[PDB]
Amino acid sequence: KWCFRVCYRGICYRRCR
């Protein structure tokens, strides 16, 4: 249960699951 945030094309979004 851990969320991560990474920016690809300049867009940062949360990546939790």
Tab-separated table of C-alpha atoms in Angstrom:
chain	number	residue	atom	x	y	z
A	1	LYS	CA	0.000	0.000	0.000
A	2	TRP	CA	2.272	2.763	-1.292
A	3	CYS	CA	1.695	5.614	-3.743
A	4	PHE	CA	4.275	7.036	-6.147
A	5	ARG	CA	4.494	10.115	-8.367
A	6	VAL	CA	6.493	10.350	-11.592
A	7	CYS	CA	6.477	12.880	-14.432
A	8	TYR	CA	6.759	11.657	-18.023
A	9	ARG	CA	5.966	14.268	-20.670
A	10	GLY	CA	6.073	17.037	-18.067
A	11	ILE	CA	2.837	15.775	-16.518
A	12	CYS	CA	3.043	14.500	-12.943
A	13	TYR	CA	0.354	12.136	-11.663
A	14	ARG	CA	-0.116	9.798	-8.707
A	15	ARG	CA	0.519	6.102	-9.320
A	16	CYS	CA	-1.009	4.173	-6.419
A	17	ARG	CA	-2.487	0.679	-6.348
